Symmetry: C3
Subunit: 277 residues, 3 copies
């Protein structure tokens, strides 16, 4: 199913989405370079617990349109606002994962929380990944991000194999917490995304969200794996926990970035406890 969020030349920009179940709406927002189907272990647990689960594919990924425009978090937050206004959701829960946590913060800051009950940040990028003089807790300098763009442009297909080795910590988890076949599914999903979004999305990951975080005025959850090699915990959740001390804060020791699959039981327990509160 599709929601139209914009236009590019002669074509509409349509996001693929799904809407399942009955109950309070929970909107699940994926990250690079996957799709809404990557939430399947959480969607099954939320449907059995009595929630309505909405997932969509961000622009440039999954089954959504693949424009060459609008790769910035303000546009990703506008796309989320169109999804929530078109479905007319109230008392919704926004749950972001990985790089999809950028539009959760930017939506709250720009559009406010009238439709929102709670927000959750899983393996998040906040508050500001770029290491600069005024941000010593950043993870890396600009050259690191330019390097990821040059590797995607050189051969995105081979890039995804090295990316998923560090996303799931395959040297530790292949064969035990993730199978070869689930990794193959993730590679197929990345290869179906748009070529232009794959090389443009890395330029958004050094957006500064420090001014957005104090605008969060609803209950929040911050969850992160301490073995994350993609978004290191010392530069992301441990700094975010100091900026937003009201949030529930959960560290999953040893988990990688791709913990929605590898550590699904621990993620589901923490999400269900936060949703019931």
């Amino acid at each position: 199913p599709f929601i139209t969020v914009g236009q590019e030349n002669s074509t509409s920009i349509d996001l693929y989405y799904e809407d399942h179940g009955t109950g309070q709406p929970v909107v699940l927002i994926h990250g690079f370079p996957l799709s809404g189907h990557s939430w399947e272990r959480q969607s099954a647990a939320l449907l059995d617990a009595g929630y309505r689960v909405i997932t969509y594919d961000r622009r440039g990924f999954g089954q959504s349109s693949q424009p060459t425009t609008g790769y910035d978090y303000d546009t990703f937050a506008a796309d989320l606002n169109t999804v929530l206004e078109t479905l007319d959701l109230q008392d919704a829960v926004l749950v972001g994962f990985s790089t999809g946590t950028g539009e959760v913060a930017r939506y709250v800051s720009s559009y406010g929380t009238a439709r929102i009950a709670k927000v959750a940040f899983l393996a998040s990028l906040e508050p500001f990944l770029l290491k600069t003089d005024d941000n010593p807790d950043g993870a890396a300098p600009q050259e690191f991000f330019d390097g990821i763009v040059a590797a995607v442009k050189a051969d995105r297909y081979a890039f995804y194999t090295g990316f998923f080795n560090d996303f799931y910590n395959l040297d530790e988890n292949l064969g035990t917490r993730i199978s070869e076949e689930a990794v193959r599914n993730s590679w197929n999903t990345a290869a179906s995304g748009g070529f232009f979004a794959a090389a443009a999305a890395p330029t958004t990951w050094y957006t500064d969200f420090r001014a957005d975080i104090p605008r969060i005025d609803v209950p929040a959850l911050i969850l992160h794996g301490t073995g994350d090699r993609t978004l290191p915990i010392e530069n992301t959740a441990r700094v975010f926990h100091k900026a937003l001390p009201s949030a529930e804060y959960v560290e999953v020791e040893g988990a990688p970035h791709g913990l929605l699959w590898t550590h699904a039981e621990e993620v589901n327990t923490a999400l269900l406890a936060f949703l019931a509160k």
Copy 2:
């Protein structure tokens, strides 16, 4: 192309279908966990023989919508009735394979045969797979089916590799009657189906069709491989042949469940003989 069969929350439930050729309509219904494209060796032979071939992807599979509702044979038969009424088919032939043979029997029993010339059951599940006191010919107890649901929920992607080894009898047929690349295609098609249908469909396979079978009042074909490890012939076609002795009955010695590919010549010969009669 799509036919709408229902609605789920804000979305429509749409089935992907194709409509090719000129002649008497033959509707081909696949089984778990494939799609209408799995009939390609039969569709090519039926098109060369002068038939119109309609294939569709059942709800939850292939390119169709992926709802979390309606996984029962009465709904699958309602979806088939919507396809036949929307296309306004007359004198049609219904050909089911594998678990898609359940809605062929349930459609005939609920809706009757005014639009139907003939029906065919290939590698079928009838009459009632569950072994109970009143059904000693059933294949297995309830716990077997619950086990398949728990294995799909644990990791559907790795489940499909073991499933296809027994679906095609790969220890006998890999390299001779089926290539590694055709198996890879089947895994890709299973992984594109919906996560909720994959774990829900196994709970429909122990439906009792014994009261539906005496309502079949048109010519019928029953075909099965004697090497089927998925739906064993002693619990399915040999018992169905006693319940419906009017049907043409064809055993293909040594063929597995996935015989539309591995034994396409023998299936096509038997289908073309039955269609011309």
Copy 3:
């Protein structure tokens, strides 16, 4: 996004297309058995240089409909005419690759060049691949083409692995100019195309375009790799260069048929020089 080009029984024949950028329109037409996404290394360079890039999937391939009718170059040229008339393109550049160069010549000959600024033929099939008495420069006799049809019908999935070994010259280029993952993407794209188009398209490759070539009355580029094992250069571009001596003519020594990937820098340099002229 989709453009409707025809109807087959109850369904429309829709071609998937994309429309990116701002500038003079450049329409990129792929060949067998890929899709418009195979132009990604050229589309990125044309977008950075200031052109509007339109790509579409030919009937039977990629994300387009999969009819069982209309596999001939006059219909493929009609589909291109519908794309150009629906988008109302003017001063457009048509760039064909591989077997998609047949509809570029047939469009110009049948419909004329009022909408067209320039045309380009990359790894092309012209002027007439069939070796006959009146065409001694043809590549092969009829039996060669019938053989490719019989190999696709026997098992298209395994056919694509041997096809891509000669399309990319993998014995020379695997690991250096093309990765295993980019080859896997190309196999996935071929397997998503329609089964009927895969076996029908080979019967179009021996169409005679000798009467179409003198109707080209706009600037043209002819580019080909001298290591092409799919469409040999001695039977195609070197004969076309004598038939159309006005065209710019570029040989890329040692490049295979799949040179849009393996030799993207040399293709992009020659395309950008021809577009600026």
